[PDB]
Amino acid sequence: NDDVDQSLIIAARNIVRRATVSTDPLASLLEMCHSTQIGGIRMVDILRQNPTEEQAVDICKAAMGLRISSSFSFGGFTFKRTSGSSVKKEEEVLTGNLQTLKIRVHEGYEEFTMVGRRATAILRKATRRLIQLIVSGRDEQSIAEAIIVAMVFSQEDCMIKAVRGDLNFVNRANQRLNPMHQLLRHFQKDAKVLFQNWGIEPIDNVMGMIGILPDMTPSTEMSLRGVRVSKMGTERVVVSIDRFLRVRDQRGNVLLSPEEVSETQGTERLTITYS
Numbered sequence: 345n346d347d348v349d350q351s352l353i354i355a356a357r358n359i360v361r362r363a364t365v366s367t368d369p370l371a372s373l374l375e376m377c378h379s380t381q382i383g384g385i386r387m388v389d390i391l392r393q394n395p396t397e398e399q400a401v402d403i404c405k406a407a408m409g410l411r412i413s414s415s416f417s418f419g420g421f422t423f424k425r426t427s428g429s430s431v432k433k434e435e436e437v438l439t440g441n442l443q444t445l446k447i448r449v450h451e452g453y454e455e456f457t458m459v460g461r462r463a464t465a466i467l468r469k470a471t472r473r474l475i476q477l478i479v480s481g482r483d484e485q486s487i488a489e490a491i492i493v494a495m496v497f498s499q500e501d502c503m504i505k506a507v508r509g510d511l512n513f514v515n516r517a518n519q520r521l522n523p524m525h526q527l528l529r530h531f532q533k534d535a536k537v538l539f540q541n542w543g544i545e546p547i548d549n550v551m552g553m554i555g556i557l558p559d560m561t562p563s564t565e566m567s568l569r570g571v572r573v574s575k576m577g578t579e580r581v582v583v584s585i586d587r588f589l590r591v592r593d594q595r596g597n598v599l600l601s602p603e604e605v606s607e608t609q610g611t612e613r614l615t616i617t618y619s
């Protein structure tokens with residue numbers, strides 16, 4: 345099965361990337377899936393009978409009415425809300441480069457798990473407030489990637505004020521990214537100002553936990569505010585899909601879009617063919 349999964353992910357990612365530049369991505373994706381075989385089996389037959397939950401695969405599943413994980417993706421991390429709730433309120437904010445953004449601010453206490461390939465975390469937040477991030481990962485760089493995502497997701501003003509360029513990122517089709525993705529793409533390029541402005545704090549000696557400093561080095565004495573490093577680290581639902589491959593749950597939350605599909609290329613172990 346792991347080898348079916350590997351080839352299915354490659355096929356689905358290639359299809360989503362190609363579809364995104366078409367005038368009608370949903371129609372393009374459906375035609376490509378209909379015409380693709382993996383190991384000589386119709387891709388649609390694999391999608392119906394394969395439990396993989398990767399972002400591109402789940403976009404393809406949604407397009408043909410299959411149930412998918414209720415979790416969402418941000419920065420490539422799968423987020424599962426484990427406690428709490430939030431309501432959205434539009435607010436206008438001013439970045440550190442004097443650009444205004446209209447952001448859907450989430451109001452309420454929430455806890456999430458974040459699962460990525462190289463790091464995992466527990467994130468506890470309230471309105472525009474990161475409370476705790478307990479993160480585990482393969483190295484300090486992988487941990488830093490999760491921290492950046494969590495700091496942007498928190499919607500904190502100090503993150504908004506750490507922006508140092510204009511935000512005009514677009515997708516493959518030259519469509520402007522939404523504000524949360526604008527902020528994320530900015531800080532993925534360079535997080536030094538974000539990390540230097542976030543704040544540090546002293547930590548207590550807790551077995552299995554350590555701090556991480558703005559320079560991404562470990563410390564037993566201090567850490568980025570709210571952040572601790574640990575050595576320790578889903579229901580399927582009906583979703584909707586639209587022309588531009590935005591996948592929403594029944595309550596309208598945007599679980600997936602092409603912006604959350606990895607750019608990683610790979611070489612399939614089962615032949616992918618196209619008729």
Ligand SMILES: C[C@@H]1CC[C@H](C)[C@H](Nc2nc(-c3c[nH]c4c(F)cc(F)cc34)ncc2F)[C@H]1C(=O)O
Nearest residue numbers: 416417418430450454497498499522524597598599
């Ligand atoms: C990816 C887009 C940007 C961020 C994520 C991916 C959005 N999707 C969802 N966000 C939430 C959510 C809960 N609490 C939040 C918070 F405190 C801050 C925040 F930014 C989002 C949330 N819950 C379910 C979702 F499906 C997508 C969008 O809305 O465009």
